[PDB]
Amino acid sequence: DKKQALLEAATQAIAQSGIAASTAVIARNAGVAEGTLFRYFATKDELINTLYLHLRQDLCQSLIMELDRSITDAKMMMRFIWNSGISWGLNHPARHRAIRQLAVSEKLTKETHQRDLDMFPELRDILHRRVLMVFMSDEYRAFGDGLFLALAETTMDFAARDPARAGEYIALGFEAMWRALTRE
Amino acid sequence: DKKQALLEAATQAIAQSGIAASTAVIARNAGVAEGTLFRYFATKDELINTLYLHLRQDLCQSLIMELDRSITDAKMMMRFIWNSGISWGLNHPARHRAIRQLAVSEKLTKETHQRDLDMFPELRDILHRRVLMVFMSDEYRAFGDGLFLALAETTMDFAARDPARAGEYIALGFEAMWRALTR
Numbered sequence A: 001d002k003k004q005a006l007l008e009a010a011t012q013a014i015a016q017s018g019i020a021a022s023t024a025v026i027a028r029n030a031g032v033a034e035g036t037l038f039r040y041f042a043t044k045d046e047l048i049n050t051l052y053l054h055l056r057q058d059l060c061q062s063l064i065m066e067l068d069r070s071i072t073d074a075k076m077m078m079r080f081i082w083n084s085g086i087s088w089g090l091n092h093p094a095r096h097r098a099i100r101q102l103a104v105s106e107k108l109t110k111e112t113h114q115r116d117l118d119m120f121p122e123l124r125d126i127l128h129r130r131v132l133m134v135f136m137s138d139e140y141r142a143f144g145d146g147l148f149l150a151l152a153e154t155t156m157d158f159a160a161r162d163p164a165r166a167g168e169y170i171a172l173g174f175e176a177m178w179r180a181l182t183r184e
Numbered sequence B: 001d002k003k004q005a006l007l008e009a010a011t012q013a014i015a016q017s018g019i020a021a022s023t024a025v026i027a028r029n030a031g032v033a034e035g036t037l038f039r040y041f042a043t044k045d046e047l048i049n050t051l052y053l054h055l056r057q058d059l060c061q062s063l064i065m066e067l068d069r070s071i072t073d074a075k076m077m078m079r080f081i082w083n084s085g086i087s088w089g090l091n092h093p094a095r096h097r098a099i100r101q102l103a104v105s106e107k108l109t110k111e112t113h114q115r116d117l118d119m120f121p122e123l124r125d126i127l128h129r130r131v132l133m134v135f136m137s138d139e140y141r142a143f144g145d146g147l148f149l150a151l152a153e154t155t156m157d158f159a160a161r162d163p164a165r166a167g168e169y170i171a172l173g174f175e176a177m178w179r180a181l182t183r
């Protein structure tokens, strides 16, 4: 599948180099001509948006399959989601870094954000109820995502380096993020 | 001054590579033999700690010089200090990135942390009064600094890429950081 090879190649290149990764380099590492990349993605912006949703879907498969939903308290559910996302990101550091590079890019469309939210309805509902309004807004969502992902990456880095304390770092990082980004 | 040249070469190398930066490379980039580096710094860990204090001293010179001394409210003082620090880091991205790499390395000693905050007593006193106790503890201070510096660098990134909203990024990032780290 040329498209799957392109998505994997875009993941690695955008993780490494951000959205400034050129469509010509992505094509080469996928083993195809650049016109072939545009054969599957009309523009680079479409590739950015398609890749983002592809990576979010991969993450969400882990978040949802793992979700202990004997849980109805929102913060408890979010802690579980956080823990699962930490595990996913440590297992897939390039996929996680690509999500972060794409999320802070301001290239993601309204349709992409809507589909992203709707892929995981329980998470969506909690974010709309609890995240500070400015960080769900079109104007500042990318900044809210940037702050969230900065705290997530720091938590992952410390957990990876000091596994004896990993559970404590993950808990403290979740709690700091929760205070920073949510309101009662 | 080869000590200053070594500190500058160490700043750029550690900003790029973290504390894995090679002392042979730092010495070569300062134009001296590697053994000359160790005449100025007894060990690589001492270089790490001295450089951290050197860069924190530079930052604090701006923080202290800029601080409005008529402000007595702790949070408002910290908002001013945050803004001054954002300005300094945007003007000196390698120095700030080196501080971040050194802070999260866990190679900074308790004494170095003490000497660091003693350079800016107003900041020191506010941190001890307001930061969550876990993030002032020896065991989790490096993580507290990592969270702080992650929010700081994200704020700098957005203010630099979208300067038309710099004041809003700086204010939103401060409040997020403040809620993350204080009680």
Ligand SMILES: COc1ccc(Cc2nccc3cc(OC)c(OC)cc23)cc1OC
Binding pocket: A059, A078, A079, A081, A082, A083, A084, A085, A086, A089, A096, A099, A127, A131, A148, A152, A181, A182
């Ligand atoms: C550790 O990394 C993650 C952990 C959880 C998620 C799921 C998620 N996506 C978007 C916004 C989120 C916002 C959250 O809280 C504000 C949150 O708390 C668990 C999870 C969120 C994504 C993650 O990275 C993309």
Ligand SMILES: COc1ccc(Cc2nccc3cc(OC)c(OC)cc23)cc1OC
Binding pocket: B059, B078, B079, B081, B082, B083, B084, B085, B086, B089, B096, B099, B123, B127, B131, B148, B152, B153, B177, B178, B181, B182
């Ligand atoms: C934007 O970058 C900075 C801004 C302020 C400072 C000063 C400072 N140093 C250590 C811990 C700090 C912790 C703070 O709040 C918890 C704080 O609020 C203004 C400033 C802090 C350092 C900064 O980077 C090293």
